[PDB]
């Protein structure tokens, strides 16, 4: 690792600096280096890791979607043959995206998940595992597409099972997990009814638990609840 000679604390400090500078590729590289020190991550560190790679892959996904749309248009009946270039460049971005997802999944498998025993860490990492298999599923087309989808489903399901046993319904990790698993159902699994049911049940169970919360926790939970409602409005 190019970060192997840097102190763990220095890597975390630089990840925070990279975030302020909106240098998310650097942020992800720093946080990868921190993970590879082998120690468990704190709550703040887990979120630094997630923010970094979410921003990197989010940009890749946005670019892939633009290029896929151009490619599909170039292949419609009536278009001018524009050569292999659009496909080639879409493939290049796709391969880079898959590489980032494989990197994150590799960090989770070696060895973040196996050492994560507390609900807040284990659910967080299993949600990430579901998320990065979901991004792989968004671009998958071959012999392994079904297996990628099932890997996302399985990770999300284990996270859900733990979250329902160990966290209150307003816990923001539980809410964000359900938000994303609901999107998985809608966009990946072709299961819009499951997506809607999950979002609605999650929202209602959180609503009924808000009375237990401080003002700051209320803000955290209701922000994610609004995203659930936003998706339900999109879908119904």
């Amino acid at each position: 690792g190019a970060m192997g000679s840097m102190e763990r604390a220095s890597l975390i400090q630089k990840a925070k600096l990279a975030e302020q500078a909106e240098r998310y590729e650097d942020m992800a590289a720093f946080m990868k280096g921190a993970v590879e020190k082998g120690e468990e991550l704190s709550c703040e560190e887990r979120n630094l890791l997630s923010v970094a790679y979410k921003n990197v892959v989010g940009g890749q996904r946005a670019a892939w979607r633009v290029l896929s749309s151009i490619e599909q248009k170039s292949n419609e009946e009536g278009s001018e043959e524009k050569g292999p270039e659009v496909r080639e460049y879409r493939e290049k971005v796709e391969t880079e995206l898959q590489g980032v997802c494989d990197t994150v999944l590799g960090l989770l498998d070696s060895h973040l998940i196996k050492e994560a025993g507390d609900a807040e860490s284990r659910v967080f990492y299993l949600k990430m595992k579901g998320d990065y298999y979901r991004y792989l599923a968004e671009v998958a087309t071959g012999d392994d597409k079904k297996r990628i989808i099932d890997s996302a489903r399985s990770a999300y399901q284990e996270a859900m099972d733990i979250s329902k046993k160990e966290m209150p319904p307003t816990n923001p990790i539980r809410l964000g997990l359900a938000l994303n698993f609901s999107v998985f159902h809608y966009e990946i699994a072709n299961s819009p009814e499951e997506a809607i049911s999950l979002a609605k049940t999650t929202f209602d169970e959180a609503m009924a638990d808000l009375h237990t919360l401080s003002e700051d926790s209320y803000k955290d939970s209701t922000l994610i609840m609004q995203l659930l409602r936003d998706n339900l409005t999109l879908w119904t």
Binding site: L179, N180, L234
Partner: peptide
């Protein structure tokens, strides 16, 4: 595109 976090 739907919201995720």
């Amino acid at each position: 595109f739907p919201a995720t976090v």
